[PDB]
Design a protein around this ligand. Sequence first.
Ligand SMILES: [Mg+2]
Ligand SMILES: [Zn+2]
Ligand SMILES: [Zn+2]
Lengths: 1338, 71
Amino acid sequence: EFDAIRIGLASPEMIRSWSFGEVKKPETINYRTFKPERDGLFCAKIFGPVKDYECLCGKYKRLKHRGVICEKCGVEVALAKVRRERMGHIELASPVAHIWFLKSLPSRIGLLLDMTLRDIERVLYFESYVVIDPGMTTLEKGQLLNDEQYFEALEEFGDDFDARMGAEAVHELLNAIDLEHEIGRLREEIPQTNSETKIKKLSKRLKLMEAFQGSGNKPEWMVLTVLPVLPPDLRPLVPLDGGRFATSDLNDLYRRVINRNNRLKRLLDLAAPDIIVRNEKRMLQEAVDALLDNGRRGRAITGSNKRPLKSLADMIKGKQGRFRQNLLGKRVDYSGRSVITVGPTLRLHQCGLPKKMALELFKPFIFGKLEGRGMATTIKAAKKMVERELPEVWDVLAEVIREHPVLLNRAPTLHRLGIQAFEPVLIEGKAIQLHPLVCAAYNADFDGDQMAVHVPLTLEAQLEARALMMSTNNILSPANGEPIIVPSQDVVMGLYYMTREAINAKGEGMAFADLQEVDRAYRSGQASLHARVKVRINEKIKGEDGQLTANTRIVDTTVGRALLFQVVPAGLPFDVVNQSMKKKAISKLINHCYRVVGLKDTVIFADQLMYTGFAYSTISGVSIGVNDFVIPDEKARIINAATDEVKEIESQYASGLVTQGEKYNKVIDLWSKANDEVSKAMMANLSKEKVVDREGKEVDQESFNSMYMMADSGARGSAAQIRQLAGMRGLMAKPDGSIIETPITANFREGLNVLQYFISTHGARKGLADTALKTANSGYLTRRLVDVAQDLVVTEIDCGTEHGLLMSPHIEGGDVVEPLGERVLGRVIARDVFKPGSDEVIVPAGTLIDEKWVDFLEVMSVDEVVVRSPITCETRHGICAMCYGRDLARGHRVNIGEAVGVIAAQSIGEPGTQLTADNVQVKNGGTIRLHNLKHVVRADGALVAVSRSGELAVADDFGRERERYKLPYGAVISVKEGDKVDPGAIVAKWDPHTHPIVTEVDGTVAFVGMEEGITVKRQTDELTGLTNIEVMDPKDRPAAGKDIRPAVKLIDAAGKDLLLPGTDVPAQYFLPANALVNLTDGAKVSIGDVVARIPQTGGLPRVADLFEARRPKEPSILAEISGTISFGKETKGKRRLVITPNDGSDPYEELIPKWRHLNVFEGEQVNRGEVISDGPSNPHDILRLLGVSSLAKYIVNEIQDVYRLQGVKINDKHIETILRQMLRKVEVSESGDSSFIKGDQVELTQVLEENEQLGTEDKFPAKYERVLLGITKASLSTESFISAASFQETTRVLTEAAVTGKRDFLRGLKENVVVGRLIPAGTGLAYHSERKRQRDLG
Amino acid sequence: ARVTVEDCLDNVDNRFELVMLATKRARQLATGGKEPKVAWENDKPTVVALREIASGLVDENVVQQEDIVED
Ligand SMILES: [Mg+2]
Ligand SMILES: [Zn+2]
Ligand SMILES: [Zn+2]
């Protein structure tokens, strides 16, 4: 019913309005009787009555007396609950300064009076004097007076002089602040200065003056003359067992202030001198200061207690405040918990609930059902029927839970699927019966785990549990498009054994007329579960639009595959069950079934797979024995051979042939080769060992082994675990990071030695102790991601924008690791894609790409698509519904009101617990196309590359790029452009050791200044191994010749001057150190002359440091303007990286350190997006030099590389959603229109550019530049102060919002939670929409 | 039977107005004495209100018209 919760300073006239009386005495209660004494901290006259509708005297103790107040000893008759609302006030005899507005990062009182923080603390303690209204005196208001300097002021001036000391002086300095006049003085003195050390000081002081003018807070209210008193029920004084009392830490603080305030009031009427009264007023300062906050310069009282104290401010801060303790947890009613238990007979939408828990959870619903049915007359008699557990109560409990869903949640709630709704059924026992299929989303095993229950009361919450939070609704993952409710290891084991073709079995070759004859033949024991038969099947096809046509055909399948087709819905063909039904094949069938037949026929199909998997996994009594871990007979021939190859190396180590490091890499790489040789020889004997007999033969089929089936079907176990059971274990690691020389040549079947078992304990406790950090670091990452993208919610249906980012498949390497099939599925196109022809489009407009459009794009040769993304949306205060897409638990696109920012932070933080160049060669065959690579053809028939911004691509015959390779500078190209490459042959060669050079033109070039005595040195190898011009180092040069550098002058053969086009200066490049000149002086090649040869962290903390946009330890150096770069002076200490732009006239000079080894040379033109020095690059300069399209490509592909290595997969919409909130603030480059030099939000900067353009001003010179903020700094930019006090410092955000009169609205999620209102996201959007159209309209 | 949450949500396709449309109808079947258009199959008014959404018997203007006749 309320809105716009505002906050400001409290005036002395308003503090008296909150109070109902003034406290004068410091006592609380009487010693004989436990009654609140008058005019004390506990007083029934000021506050409310103690007992319900009764005064202290007892003259009025009935309901008929409400406004009547007794005169002798009674109080105002109330409900005894107003003791939480009634307040008091203590009219202090001397003013006291507020420490919240004095001791902080900014000086709220110091900046307001142009005074120092230490100097104000000197006057408030009665040590120095200040002057009020100096005027015609000889001193300034900023000049203070001492005890010996103040006495002289009254002698020479006499008139026009007024000086005070203490808190009354600070209160007087704020009386004549001249608010309407001081701003006029700051406006005319700010543009005169030019140093940045004074701009940030005068502007920060100016912005505080306008805050005290529009908000209405007078500067006089910073010091208080009367303080409020907390209600007594908030600081309770309750007794304990044995007559002992227990009070709060605020009663003795309030008593200490009253004890000193009354002592000061009595010390003023006795005409006491200034020597004694100045110390009492000083004690009243720290008496009130210690009451407000603790930890400041005023040490809190500590008497007979260890902890210092708990003041008023300590109740809302310090990781234990009342505001922060409720944000992390709150006990609720109608709840309970118990252990979980598998129930294989339950449906997907129902769970098991004990009878003892249902009686307590649904207790109010039974009392109302017993009175309505006529079994009980009053609620007191109905309660006694439940305690006796009458038989008629069970018939009532069964009716109140028939259609009433309950909520189940596990303690670690990592993602959205941690809370699901089920229909409870009454079961006998004390354990909650859970469905086996919902165990994957809950991440719950049956090792004693507990699950909490909750009961929705209102029918508004019951409809949300059935339509939104039901277990059958969230069958797909919210992070991907894959089903999250899939058959686990026990169900996939029965479906794999059933569909497992055998060579020769009982009942092979027989024909069946229908699927009902197959079951009739199997149940009689006259046909094996898997035998090659031929059965006629009647199936229906949903491929036709709206036509469910039936087809009857004779297929060649097994007996088990025909029994599995009985549960398949009608819309799916038979070719979906003719495989071996592994885990990856069943999850793809449920996903395909969801997109064809819908949801109703899928929730009843996933239950049939669980019943069929549990039934056929029990008939086949699969078991693991001691003979299942078969050992290859050739394992002893590899271990004994590898042990002899190390003995011949240990003899070489004792002879001095190899070193310690050379022998280490020899024995480590030797055992790693023998470990892979045993693993490939074990899987060959384990998979193809089953032999059979068909009409007389020895045929090898797939192995029907228990250990092989559990790893092939994907139920449990992988190649790394079966390797340690049958094959050798291998080499173990070490907590230091090295590998031990002696490996573990034994497996777990044969057993390990005492030393081999102690070695394995190093990596065992390393992985167990790593899980303690995986739950502490990933939980801190998902919490920071929510605090940033919580306000983001779908609000608009259509933005109307055409901007979008280009999407291309990852063609890095040989094949595409992630094609355009899953990168574009579920995203609306931005621009119309065009065929290679003319006037022919594939998509008509921006359309939602579903599974039917993915194959339509795979048939065509379309490789690039422009899709919509939240990072490019134009919707202010929200995100468009068409820019998001349809990648969620639903099939359709996102609806209006869906909080897509919270499901994106939970999709990234959930899998966080699982986180920790000589030559090129074309792999496939196709055309070779080079982009952005300007080459110069030589005379021999080869190509030389001068730029590095491009790369080599392999064009398919259809017209799609499937291979991309990067080439360094000067890489010689063997093949030409536009020819058919050879799969397996080289196309270009490079030189990663020595960086080659390039020449622009041919001619007789010779080294100038190469005397071979100071600059260079003629080096000769053994047996004429080196005959060239070898350069020398700069340190080896002489002191006189260090200034001169060897340079090569390019001259033509005719003698004329040769100048490069587009540049005035010729091609004169100086040869650096450690270079070799292949061409002689006066003779060189026509092109491609190498004159000088220039010689040459992962896991969870990687993703956390990547969202923070931190600068790496060695940032890379990039170019700003596209032009010819050059060096500067090297003997000074730095490197002047001068560069002359060739297209524009704008020279820009920058400096570079010398410890960072540069990779660029002198005289080479570089582009804007080219890298100069190697090393990791921060995401900050890539946004300024390239733009926002290149930043969104680098961040997403770098985060996915950390998740794709571990196997998990997250959609790109969740990374671009968090990236939208980081690229939210903007910064202006020039000043004149903004207030300060810093930047503001882009939503406010865009709404002001339209009013200034189409208004009185013609142009818009106030431009801006995009900036990148981390998930820590972007969260601080919150206009609200209620939500900002949760994750930030409470005492810092309350003093800033008070002095500015910040009226906080409740248009967010985190604000409406602690306040108690509905959230704008979800079903609560209809409540906030029906109020906006009725408040600002009619 | 007749318990379909995806058939009623297929026409609106919002999953948020369906909860709001079924709320205004569930109170009429529980308070006021309004007779549902579908038969009572021993179901609570919370679930029997979703059958009228899937069958297309009630709508946004149908619930507003039935409640205005009582006032
Ligand atoms: Mg467990
Ligand atoms: Zn009385
Ligand atoms: Zn949009």
